[PDB]
Amino acid sequence: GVPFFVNRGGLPVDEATWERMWKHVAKIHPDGEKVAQRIRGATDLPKIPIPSVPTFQPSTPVPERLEAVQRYIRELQYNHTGTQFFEIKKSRPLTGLMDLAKEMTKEALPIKCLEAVILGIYLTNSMPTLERFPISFKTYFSGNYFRHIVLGVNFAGRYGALGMSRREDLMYKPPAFRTLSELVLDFEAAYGRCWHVLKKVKLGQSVSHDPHSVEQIEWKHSVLDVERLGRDDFRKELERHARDMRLKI
Amino acid sequence: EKAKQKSAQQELKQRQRAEIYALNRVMTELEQQ
Ligand SMILES: *[C@@H](C(=O)N[C@@H](Cc1ccc(O)cc1)C(=O)O)[C@@H](O)C(=O)OCC
Predict the structure, then answer these.
(1) Result of mutating residue 17 to E (chain B)?
(2) For chain A, what are the domain ranges?
(3) Rounded to the nearest 10 degrees, what angle do helices A62-76 and A113-124 cross at?
(4) Distance between CA atoms of B6 and B2, rounded to whole angstroms?
(5) A158-162 and A5-6 strand pairing
(6) Which of A13, A87, A113, A183 is buried most deeply by CB count within 10 Å?
């Protein structure tokens, strides 16, 4: 899709990556140089509260906990700076990704969709009756392809999603959809309303609730070519994926 | 002097975080309209 830079050296951001971030800002913002000159070195900038990591009473129903998890994710803000602040190697053992999610909560910087998936896993490992599985969507608009990922969830046989997007309709879904197909079709319709064609859906397996697991997340357990499949086989493949997940414990 | 070195690192992160969020507000407003 559209390229972006990634901070690959931890925090604080190293000098070269920091300059690269501002050079990118000066390129794409019509007032890019003036923006840097106002912000860089300024001593009167707002203090940003560090968002409080939500903790849950055992009497609180899981869907209410998920609302709080999503509110926390949103509080960090979608990262529009052009530089991703945490590097996510998707094939890392879960325990390493959970260490990274912990650092996201300590450092409290803006994030994009994949970081939010990792954070959503970290913040729901305390909910063993909730199953979590990544859902990636590839869409098409005006000659370019777009990649998006959310954390699908299943509570008591109902499907929803957590995550981060620059669009309000492409992240949070309360766990109320009767079937996985209905959840994915809702995302497809949301994409269509903002004129994106849904091309591929990639669904992962259920993710362990053990933050010290050495297992990898299995991102691409089902890879569905929406137009090639057509409507009926699309639904059947999503039903099959939902069954596959019910058996991974 | 390890406690002071961590202090300098934490201050670096604080100054950077404030600039990141100030920049993010500007770029968010640009991305929207
Ligand atoms: C995934 C991510 O943040 N994806 C973007 C996808 C997108 C949607 C709509 C428009 O107009 C542009 C882009 C999102 O959900 O906002 C994240 O890991 C990522 O960096 O993907 C590339 C943007």
Answers:
(1) Decreased VASH1 tyrosine carboxypeptidase activity on alpha-tubulin
(2) 1-249
(3) 140
(4) 6
(5) unpaired
(6) A183
Vertex A207, ends A183 and A129: CA angle to 5°? 75
Block residue for tokens 């954390």 = A151
Q: In angstroms, rounded to a whole number, what is the distance separating the alpha carbons of residues A203 and A149?
A: 10
Structure tokens given for B20: 């990141």
β-bridge partners, A78:
A111
The experimental technique used to determine this model is X-ray
Residue nearest atom 23 of ligand 1, based on CA coordinates: A147
From the list A85, A109, A166, which residue is nearest B31 (CB)? A166
Q: Give the resolution value in Å.
A: 1.6
- Chain B positions touching A85 (Cβ under 8 A) are 20
CA-wise closest residue to A136 among A217, A70, A77, A213: A217
Ligand 1 pocket test target in A137, A148, A167, A172 with most atoms within 8 Å of CB: A148
Widest CA span in chain B: 49
